């Protein structure tokens, strides 16, 4: 199953400074394009190599859209102020996530469209691409406005047709590239003892995509109790890292095995100290 999303943000600036708008496109969770109003030359720029294959007609068309959306947020961000009795100039943030999933049959699975004011949900388009879910009494004014204008129907179109159409295309442009996988280079480290206990840390470094599974076991039985794990983190070079640790009762070091499961691995790794 495949998908495409566009995370957009418009953050209000303290002063008379026009709100900063930023848009990021994502194909199969990989950022592929990006627009930012702060740039000297605000334009939608390639964010993945398989995207450079697009001609100027594309980049100008997309940039036009981003500049229209830029003003769309300037207004709505202005309206939310009223809706929420907010003042003249403070820090205000509005973001929207839209896109579409494609099942295994390459036919539309789900379409998305949702907003959030100040990091909290505001209004989402239900899976029927017709009705809305307003989060609070404020979002009621917008929903009723969007029910009046028949806004939902116009997002149903983009979602079922243009989003689906264009995802099929980027998927074709980024074949092997999006499907590439870098295998983790694992290793285990040893750390000083607390009278009657030593820490065993299993490291998995240099992998892509981010999804990885690390496990510490004892004599075969997986010990999940008191296992320390870090949230997967980017190395900064496009790969990810992570580690699993267990404060092990010394002497019994070799009694512990670590497995690493990653899509890039031909066989899951097993390691020990």
């Amino acid at each position: 199953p495949h998908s495409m999303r566009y995370f957009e943000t418009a953050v209000s600036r303290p002063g008379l400074e026009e709100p900063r708008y930023i848009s990021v496109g994502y194909v199969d969770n990989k950022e592929f394009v990006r627009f930012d109003s702060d740039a000297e030359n605000p334009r939608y720029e390639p964010r993945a190599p398989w995207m450079e294959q697009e001609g100027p007609e594309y980049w100008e068309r997309e940039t036009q859209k981003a500049k229209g959306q830029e003003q769309w947020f300037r207004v709505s961000l202005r309206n939310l102020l009223g809706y929420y009795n907010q003042s003249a100039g403070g820090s205000h943030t509005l973001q929207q996530m839209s896109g579409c999933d494609l099942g295994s049959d390459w036919r539309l699975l789900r379409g998305y469209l949702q907003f959030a004011y100040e990091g909290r949900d505001y209004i989402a388009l239900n899976e029927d691409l017709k009705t809305w879910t307003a989060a609070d009494m404020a979002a009621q004014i917008t929903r009723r406005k969007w029910e009046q204008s028949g806004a939902a129907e116009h997002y149903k179109a983009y979602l079922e047709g243009e989003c689906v159409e264009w995802l099929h295309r980027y998927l074709k442009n980024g074949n092997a590239t999006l499907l590439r996988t870098d295998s983790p280079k694992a290793h285990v480290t040893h750390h000083p003892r607390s009278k009657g206990e030593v820490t065993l840390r299993c490291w998995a470094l240099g992998f892509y995509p981010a999804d990885i599974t690390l496990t510490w076991q004892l004599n075969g039985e997986e010990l999940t109790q008191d296992m320390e794990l870090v949230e997967t983190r980017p190395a900064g070079d496009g790969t990810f890292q992570k580690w699993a640790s267990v404060v092990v009762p010394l002497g019994k070091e070799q009694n512990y095995t670590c497995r690493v499961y990653h899509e890039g691995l031909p066989e899951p790794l097993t390691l020990r100290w």
Binding site: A66, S98, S149
Partner: peptide, 9 residues
């Protein structure tokens, strides 16, 4: 292909 025209909030 990015989002387009739409009614305000």
């Amino acid at each position: 292909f990015a989002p387009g025209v739409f009614p305000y909030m």
